[PDB]
Amino acid sequence: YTPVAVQCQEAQLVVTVHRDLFGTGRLINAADLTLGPAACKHSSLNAAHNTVTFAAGLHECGSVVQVTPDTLIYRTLINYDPSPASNPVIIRTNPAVIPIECHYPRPTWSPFNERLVFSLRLMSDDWSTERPFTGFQLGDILNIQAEVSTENHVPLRLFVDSCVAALSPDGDSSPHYAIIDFNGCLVDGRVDDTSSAFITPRPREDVLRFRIDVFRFAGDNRNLIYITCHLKVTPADQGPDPQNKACSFNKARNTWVPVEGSRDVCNCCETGNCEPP
Amino acid sequence: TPVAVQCQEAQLVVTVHRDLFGTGRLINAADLTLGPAACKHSSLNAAHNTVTFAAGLHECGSVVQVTPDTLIYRTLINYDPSPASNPVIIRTNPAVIPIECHYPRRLVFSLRLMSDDWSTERPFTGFQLGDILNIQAEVSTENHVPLRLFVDSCVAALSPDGDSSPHYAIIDFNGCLVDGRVDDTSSAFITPRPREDVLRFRIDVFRFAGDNRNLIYITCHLKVTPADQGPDPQNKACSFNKARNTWVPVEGSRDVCNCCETGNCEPP
């Protein structure tokens, strides 16, 4: 018995779901199931065993791709959103989300003049390996590792200009929350009782690690987040400045602290504006 | 534990540690309240980081259950965190801690929450959407003549006042279990009765939209008639059955439930 079956084809995925998804006796309505953050509708249904099928290109419906050295991983989900009760003041059934994944085998130059591959990885606490995207509780900490491919090019230093959390891959949607802002200020660490910060020292100049206390969005009954970050590089030995930096707020010392560079490059973090003239 | 309850003669005194989750992180005193009325604390002990609530046994929206030999007063401590730096996110979950006080006792109607086999009474905690409330209404076997028990209405709400918003009528129109009429619920009166002076019914669990405490109170209007008397549109217990698309009385002629569909069973 396979409640959710995923076919990872050449350039699409096909997902087949049993409407007896929860084994409560009751079959869910086909129209209550959608694919991806975009909530794409089902492509077919089958009465023989009451299944619902979704078929979408690998980049469609708000899926997310991770490019590792030797694999491409596409991640999406199946949404179950029960229709409202006849009287909307009550709720009889919670929405649910089922994660879906597809794995596929996959003279030096200078980007400042042959393509950089940027990536974000969710790491175990000890940073030894990558960890599952499930099983997070308030209280937990996200260990995020930003990196940029290193094959045959000039040495680079990596920065994260901004990271925004939201309920979909579009960080401009509401609700959303800026974790890093103002060109590398980890503003989440400035407030409340968080311990969010960039890690020092870096493992390499082209890697940047940071820790974010888990949080959730008010009013969200699906219990997920997407984080979208703007990564950029400079030449490795270039001096950090107010537009290119990684700064954390250290609550114990009550000051901003750069991963590298002069202390005062972080001054603009407190004022909330690191934009040049 | 982090919550100490003193059940005194005519009040209860509840002392709560602000280190409420054993993490060492202290909650704000003003984020804790007592009862569904959200009564504020009566004192603080800074040295020990505790917060104390004191209320009469009938105050702050407490609920009393009268058993043969015991009086049970039930209430709760609400923890509702103040807004995060940016209110669109939550860093700290709310919480509800049930509080109970038992006293020897010194027509009586009653509602009891039963296990699904109806053998015993069950805890008020640990419900999840998908579960079923089994409610047993009854009326004390006083000497007086044999009686039949009906439930005219039941209304769910966020406090013992069923007139407050939000609320939801589970039983309406003098004994029509309207919750069974709609959506995909299986809510219904049970047949047959154990006794004419007992009435059982089951309700699919639900919760109120926008309520982060995740609790409900149900208040019911119970009444009796002489046991022998015929049910009528004013005195009945009717369930809807979607399969057959019909209302069905626990006892009495089928047509006594007709008024259920129209939404008015008052006699003019």
Partner: peptide
């Protein structure tokens, strides 16, 4: 300005909005 936008997720949280430490 050599840069890129990278998305990470979906990160799935627990369904228990009353979850707390032991």
């Amino acid at each position: 300005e050599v840069a890129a936008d990278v998305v990470i997720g979906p990160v799935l949280l627990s369904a228990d909005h009353h979850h707390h430490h032991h």
